[PDB]
Design a protein around this ligand. Structure first.
Ligand SMILES: N#Cc1cc(=O)[nH]c(=O)n1[C@@H]1O[C@H](COP(=O)(O)O)[C@@H](O)[C@H]1O
Ligand SMILES: N#Cc1cc(=O)[nH]c(=O)n1[C@@H]1O[C@H](COP(=O)(O)O)[C@@H](O)[C@H]1O
Lengths: 215, 215
């Protein structure tokens, strides 16, 4: 991804989301669109973004249902033009496999979310995360998400998935993660509020890239 | 809920979803709408159903993000007219509390999904599920979801949440669960495909209710 930086576009207004995305487009090559924007403006926003910005779109839908429902969610999401979808690993291998089957059918990608970045992830997810990552490897998952807020965990996740797998990492900025340290282990960082709530989102993005280029 | 039966409306077409829901409306009082329908037809389908059918709507969005994103998802969902939202407990107490805070602000309800009904739930969720339920009790959650496919687990979950808590249960019919056995422990059952894929959905719903009445 361009400059190893993915914008988490979680504004909930089409005009504000378009404005900020257009302002930082020279500094990114992929935008993560989640439910805050989609549930407020509709699934058509994915193809609008893909067209107007020529960016790749990751649908951060944290898919976490039974296999039959996961298949439907993935089909709707790729039909809407998303390049990839983020899927939770904790519902188990059959739920992940359902998403992989639809991605194979539609020529798209699945990212497996292993450990999450927020404090509550320590309660249940962290204890299962190594095993979720190993499950991913066994299923042939090549794209993973793990937490900027815990670089020791990001290191362990990288160890499990190997160097060939692609690893992206949220929790940079607002949640306390650091771009440089996270990029020791992740291929790309995801950044939302530090950019989209900034007085000058382009200046915020540029500042991040300057720190990245230095690594 | 009327007749202790909630329709899981996971058809992806507005016309088919409206047809089936209309045909079975005399036998239910609540419709569970999830991402298959919403991502295909838009969030406005929630208010359409509420208006047309005068039914309560549970948004089955399996909310499973960090606290800040959860609050955004819950706000959009209640703005759209949902009566309640289903939230995963696996991501931890702060993520659940974020949803409870928005439900409190907006005068709506949260259902906490503890153990899931599909085979993959055995890998990670089942081992955490008693603790997820206890966490719900500690947070003051009053509405829970647990699996028709494992009535011994449903019994244990009922034990933890007490008799005053409201418990709904999917996995009836297509996934193998039984209405009568599940209603030993749950207050209401959720049924999707056994009704919506039936040649005569009204006849399928009526058959289920006849079996419920006998208990
Ligand atoms: N993908 C993802 C995901 C997994 C995770 O463990 N932690 C996150 O913050 N996220 C998402 O990344 C973004 C982080 O944004 P921010 O930079 O904290 O504002 C949000 O969209 C959040 O929902
Ligand atoms: N709520 C919920 C949920 C939790 C769970 O553990 N198992 C489920 O099947 N569900 C949902 O209930 C419905 C079950 O539908 P069906 O009766 O198997 O066709 C689907 O919407 C599924 O996504």
């Amino acid at each position: 991804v361009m400059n190893r930086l993915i914008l988490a576009m979680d504004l909930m207004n089409r005009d504000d989301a378009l404005r900020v995305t257009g302002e930082v487009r020279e500094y990114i090559d992929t935008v993560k669109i989640g439910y805050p924007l989609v549930l407020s403006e509709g699934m058509d926003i994915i193809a609008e973004f893909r067209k107007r910005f020529g960016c790749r779109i990751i649908a951060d839908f944290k898919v976490a249902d039974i296999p039959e429902t996961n298949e439907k969610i993935c089909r709707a999401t790729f039909k809407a033009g998303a390049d990839a979808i983020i899927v939770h690993g904790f519902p188990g291998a059959d739920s992940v496999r359902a998403c992989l089957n639809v991605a194979e059918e539609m020529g798209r990608e699945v990212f497996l979310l292993t450990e999450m970045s927020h404090p509550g992830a320590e309660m249940f997810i962290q204890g299962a995360a190594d095993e979720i990552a190993r499950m991913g490897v066994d299923l042939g998952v090549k794209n993973y998400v793990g937490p900027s807020t815990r670089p020791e965990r990001l290191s362990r996740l990288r160890e499990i998935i190997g160097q060939d797998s692609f690893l992206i990492s949220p929790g940079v900025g607002a949640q306390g993660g650091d771009p440089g340290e996270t990029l020791r282990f992740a291929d790309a960082i995801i950044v939302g509020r530090s950019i989209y709530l900034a007085d000058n989102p382009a200046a915020a993005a540029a500042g991040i890239i300057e720190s990245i280029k230095d690594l």
